[PDB]
Write a protein that binds this ligand. Structure first.
Ligand SMILES: NC(=O)c1ccc[n+]([C@@H]2O[C@H](COP(=O)([O-])OP(=O)(O)OC[C@H]3O[C@@H](n4cnc5c(N)ncnc54)[C@H](O)[C@@H]3O)[C@@H](O)[C@H]2O)c1
Ligand SMILES: NC(=O)c1ccc[n+]([C@@H]2O[C@H](COP(=O)([O-])OP(=O)(O)OC[C@H]3O[C@@H](n4cnc5c(N)ncnc54)[C@H](O)[C@@H]3O)[C@@H](O)[C@H]2O)c1
Ligand SMILES: Cc1c(C2CN(C(=O)/C=C/c3cnc4[nH]c(=O)ccc4c3)C2)oc2ccccc12
Ligand SMILES: Cc1c(C2CN(C(=O)/C=C/c3cnc4[nH]c(=O)ccc4c3)C2)oc2ccccc12
Lengths: 258, 244
C-alpha cells in the first residue's frame, strides 16, 4: 500500500495533462487515493471527466467558485457519495487578462483587483466553509501559490496582491480549523508551465534563468509538485499546518547570480 | 524640521486617538506642509478643526470606495498642490460582522471583498490618481498590522487584506521607483482605532508619537534608502516568543 491509502480527496482546477493539478492527482492516486473532480463550466466537462477516468474516479462535478451556490450544490452532490471525505486541493487562480500587463500601477483596476482576490484567494475558504462539516478528523487542505505573493515580479502585478492575501488565508484557516482536526497548507511552486502562461508575457526566455540560477539547476515538475502536495495531503505531514512550503528547487533562497 | 520643504497628504484622521493624527502632529513638527481628507460629512468638522491647529487648511472630501471621489479630491488638490511629495494611508475597513470569533465561520464573499477593497486596493488606487503629481523623491506610506504575517484570533479577513496590502506595497515601490517614488508600510503594534506590555521587549506598547516619528522619517529623505519595506514599529513584539 501507498500512503493516503484510505483517503478521499477532491481536486479542483484540472484543465489539462500538463495542468499541475493533473500532477497532484497523479501522485495521490499513484499512492492509492480515491479522488473526486470538479470542472469549471460545461466547456471543461469533457474531458476532465476523462482524466478522472484515467485516475479511477467516477466523481465529476461542475463548480464555478465565483458563485457561492455553485460551490454549495457541488458539495451537496458530492455528499451523495462522500458523506464525509478528507480534504481538497485548491489549484484555482485567475485575474482578467489585461490585469497582468506591464507596469503594475498602470494595469491594476478595482475590478481586476476584485476578481483576482475573489477567485485566487477567497474561493479557497469559500470551499472550506461549504464542506467544513464534511471533513473527517485528520483531513487536510492544500492550495497552490507563487513567489509573487512574497516579492514584486513584473507583469505578475495583482496576482499576488492576491497570492499574499491567499497566503494569510492559509494561516487563519489552519488556525481556525486545527481544534477540529484539520490542516491547511500551501505549496509555492516554481515554474512549472501549464495553462497559466496564457496571460504571462516574456515566458520562453523566462525559464532559462531561472534555471541557471535555481540551486538544483532545473525547474520543478508537476511530478515534483504533485509529490510534495501528496505528502502535504497525507498523514505523513500530521505535524504541518499553516505552512507555506516552497517547491521552487530553492530558487527563492538564492540571490545575485549570474 | 527634517521634513521641511515637503508637501504630504494625510488621510484617515478622525480623532485625537487616530494614528494619522500623531503622524500629522509629528509631520508638522518637522515643518512639513500638510493636506487632509475626510470621508464623511460626519468627519469634515473635526478634520477641518485639526487643520487650523496644524497651520494648514487644505481639507477635502474623499471616500476611497469610489474611484470617482478619489480623482475629484486629487483634482481639487492639484489646484493648490499641482505637484506634491506623497501621502499617508491610514485607512482600513471590514464590515465586521467579520472580526468576531471563528474565522471561517465569520468570513463571507462580500466581507472578503469589502475588507480588501478599502484596506488594500485603495492605497494603489490613490497612487494611480496622483502618479502625475508626484515629485521625484516622493514617499507613499500605509499602516499595517501583524495580522498580515500571523493569524490573530478575531482579526480574520483583515489579516488577509493587510497581507494583500503589504504585497501591494512591494509592487507599488517596484512600479514607482523609476520615478523617484518610494513606498513603505509601518506594521504598528497595539496602543480613531478599533497586555502585550508584559511580553513586549520595550515593556510598553508603541504610542501615536512612536508611530508618528517613524512615518515622518519614512516620508522624509532621511529614509532615502528604504522602499517596499514593512517596518515593524511594534516594540519588537514581532520578533519575540513565549515571554512567560
Ligand atoms: N508556474 C505556474 O503555473 C504556477 C506557479 C505557482 C502557482 N501556481 C498556481 O497553481 C494553480 C494552478 O494553475 P496552473 O497554471 O498550474 O494550471 P491551470 O492554469 O490549468 O489552472 C487554472 C485553473 O483555473 C480554474 N478557474 C479559473 N476560474 C475559475 C472559476 N470561476 N471557477 C472554477 N475554476 C476556475 C480552472 O478550473 C483551471 O483549471 C493556480 O492557483 C496558480 O496561481 C501556478
Ligand atoms: N491603532 C490600531 O489599532 C492599529 C494598529 C495597527 C495598525 N493599524 C492600522 O492603522 C490604520 C488607521 O487606523 P487608526 O487606528 O489610526 O484609527 P481608525 O481605524 O479609526 O482610522 C481609520 C480612518 O479610516 C477612515 N476611513 C474609513 N473608511 C474610509 C473610506 N472608505 N475612504 C476613506 N477613508 C475611510 C476614517 O476617516 C477613519 O478615521 C488602519 O489601516 C489600521 O489597520 C491600527
Ligand atoms: C512563473 C510565473 C507565474 C505563475 C503563477 N501562475 C499564475 O498565477 C497565473 C495566473 C493567471 C491569472 N489570470 C489569468 N487570466 C487570464 O485571462 C489568462 C491566464 C491567467 C493566469 C503562473 O506567474 C508569473 C508572472 C511573472 C513571471 C513569471 C510567472
Ligand atoms: C477593527 C477594525 C478595523 C481595522 C483597524 N485595524 C486595527 O487597528 C486592528 C487592530 C487590532 C486587530 N487585531 C488584534 N488582535 C488581537 O488579538 C489583539 C490586538 C489587535 C488589534 C483593523 O477596521 C474596522 C472596520 C469596522 C469595524 C472594525 C474594524
Amino acid at each position: 500500500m501507498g500512503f493516503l491509502s484510505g483517503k478521499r480527496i477532491l481536486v479542483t482546477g484540472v484543465a489539462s495533462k500538463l495542468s499541475i493539478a493533473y500532477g497532484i492527482a497523479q501522485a495521490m492516486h499513484r499512492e492509492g487515493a480515491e479522488l473526486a473532480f470538479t470542472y469549471q463550466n460545461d466547456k471543461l466537462k469533457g474531458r476532465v471527466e476523462e482524466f478522472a477516468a484515467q485516475l479511477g474516479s467516477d466523481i465529476v462535478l461542475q463548480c464555478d467558485v465565483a458563485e457561492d451556490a455553485s460551490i454549495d450544490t457541488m458539495f451537496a452532490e458530492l455528499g451523495k457519495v462522500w458523506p464525509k471525505f478528507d480534504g481538497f486541493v485548491h489549484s484555482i487562480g485567475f485575474a482578467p487578462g489585461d490585469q497582468l500587463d506591464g507596469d503594475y500601477v498602470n494595469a491594476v483596476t478595482r475590478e481586476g483587483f476584485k476578481i483576482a482576490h475573489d477567485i485566487s484567494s477567497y474561493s479557497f475558504v469559500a470551499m472550506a466553509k461549504a464542506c467544513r462539516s464534511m471533513l473527517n478528523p485528520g483531513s487536510a487542505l492544500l492550495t497552490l501559490s507563487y513567489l509573487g505573493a512574497e516579492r514584486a515580479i513584473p507583469n505578475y502585478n495583482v496576482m499576488g496582491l492576491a497570492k499574499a492575501s491567499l497566503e494569510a488565508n492559509v494561516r487563519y484557516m489552519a488556525n481556525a480549523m486545527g481544534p477540529e482536526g484539520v490542516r491547511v497548507n500551501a505549496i509555492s511552486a516554481g515554474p512549472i508551465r501549464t495553462l497559466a502562461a496564457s496571460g504571462i508575457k516574456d515566458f520562453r526566455k523566462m525559464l532559462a534563468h531561472c534555471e541557471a540560477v535555481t540551486p538544483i539547476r532545473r525547474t520543478v515538475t508537476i511530478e515534483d509538485v504533485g509529490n510534495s502536495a501528496a505528502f502535504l495531503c497525507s498523514d505523513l505531514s500530521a505535524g504541518i499546518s499553516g505552512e507555506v512550503v516552497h517547491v521552487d528547487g530553492g530558487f527563492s533562497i538564492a540571490a545575485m547570480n549570474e
